[PDB]
Amino acid sequence: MQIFVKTLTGKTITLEVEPSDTIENVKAKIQDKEGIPPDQQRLIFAGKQLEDGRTLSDYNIQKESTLHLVLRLRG
């Protein structure tokens, strides 16, 4: 299943994920693809920051659903 991750500059990337994948799994895929360490990633869906330990299925993220990535410095 592919999902979309959009950033604030508008670059959208595409990931292959499983509904059972955790949010930290997804952040690790973003690291693998784009070099950004997971602790610098905020992922947002339905206006909510996604919690590392829960799954895409927990948030009802479907095929071709879009997430929002906001980079952050650790604080």
Residue ranges of the domains in the chain? 1-75
Report the C-alpha gap between 12 and 32 in whole angstroms: 16
The single residue listed with the structure tokens 């990931």 is 15
Are the C-beta atoms of residues 46 and 34 closer than 8 Å to each other? no
Nearest alpha-carbon partner for 56 in 41, 70, 66, 71: 66
Kind plus residue range of the DSSP H or E element containing 68:
strand 66-71
Resolution (A): 2.2
- What gap in Å lies between CA 8 and CA 19, rounded to an integer? 25
CA distance 41 to 64: 20
- φ/ψ of 4, rounded to 5, equals -115, 135
Paired sense of beta strands 48-49 and 41-45, if any: antiparallel
Virtual CA dihedral for 52, 18, 1, 11, nearest 10 degrees?
20
